[PDB]
Amino acid sequence: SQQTRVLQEKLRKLKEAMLCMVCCEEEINSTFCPCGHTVCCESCAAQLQSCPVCRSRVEHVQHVYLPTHTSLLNL
Amino acid sequence: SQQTRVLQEKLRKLKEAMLCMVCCEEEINSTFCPCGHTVCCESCAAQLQSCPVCRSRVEHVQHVYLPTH
Ligand SMILES: N[C@H]1CCN(S(=O)(=O)c2ccccc2)C1
Ligand SMILES: N[C@H]1CCN(S(=O)(=O)c2ccccc2)C1
Ligand SMILES: N[C@H]1CCN(S(=O)(=O)c2ccccc2)C1
Ligand SMILES: [Zn+2]
Ligand SMILES: [Zn+2]
Ligand SMILES: [Zn+2]
Ligand SMILES: [Zn+2]
């Protein structure tokens, strides 16, 4: 039904929000510290000197284990 | 249709996976450091001296800003 199409769109958008903002392919699993923006995969977060969202200096990256993780790289 | 019920269940499970594993009421937004387990809201994370997933000592809690929030 049309309701099935609406639910498919909601699911698709939530899943896309869990993907890296730089490569759009891998799941987000890294946090820029101390600002806390958690928007990148490990590879894309590796060489950024400043946060791509707030411009704060990246003192270090913290790996995060989230219950939503489903990609082979995070299992 | 039956597919509408299947999609509602998938959406419910994904939304429940974003909620605190301790209180089940607030969104996950905190990481236990240095282990990295990100399973609690800030109120439950503040009250735990040991990670509830791996039992490692919590050296500090890092707030996380996630695009799914
Ligand atoms: N990749 C996995 C490894 C652990 N994380 S988790 O989010 O800490 C977690 C812990 C226990 C139950 C459900 C989720 C997910
Ligand atoms: N050697 C450091 C590297 C980061 N970790 S930490 O647990 O994130 C941490 C950071 C700041 C204060 C207290 C704990 C310990
Ligand atoms: N539209 C994206 C751009 C980056 N943000 S964010 O860093 O995930 C964030 C999450 C919660 C509050 C404020 C910011 C979402
Ligand atoms: Zn990436
Ligand atoms: Zn930032
Ligand atoms: Zn909680
Ligand atoms: Zn842990």
From Swiss-Prot, chain B:
Disulphide bonds in the chain: none
Tissue occurrence: Ubiquitously expressed.
Effect recorded for residue 22 to R: Inhibits LDLR degradation
Subcellular compartments: Cytoplasm; Cell membrane
Induction line: Expression is directly activated by NR1H2 and NR1H3. Expression is not dependent of the sterol-response element-binding proteins (SREBPs). Expression is indirectly induced by LDL.
Zinc fingers (RING-type), renumbered ranges: 20-55
Residues covered by region (Critical for homodimerization): 64-66
PTM text: Autoubiquitinated.
Subunit text: Homodimer. Interacts with the E2 ubiquitin-conjugating enzyme, UBE2D1 (via RING-type zinc finger). Interacts with myosin regulatory light chain (MRLC) and TMEM4.
Role this protein plays: E3 ubiquitin-protein ligase that mediates ubiquitination and subsequent proteasomal degradation of myosin regulatory light chain (MRLC), LDLR, VLDLR and LRP8. Activity depends on E2 enzymes of the UBE2D family. Proteasomal degradation of MRLC leads to inhibit neurite outgrowth in presence of NGF by counteracting the stabilization of MRLC by saposin-like protein (CNPY2/MSAP) and reducing CNPY2-stimulated neurite outgrowth. Acts as a sterol-dependent inhibitor of cellular cholesterol uptake by mediating ubiquitination and subsequent degradation of LDLR.
Protein name: E3 ubiquitin-protein ligase MYLIP
Gene giving rise to this polypeptide: MYLIP
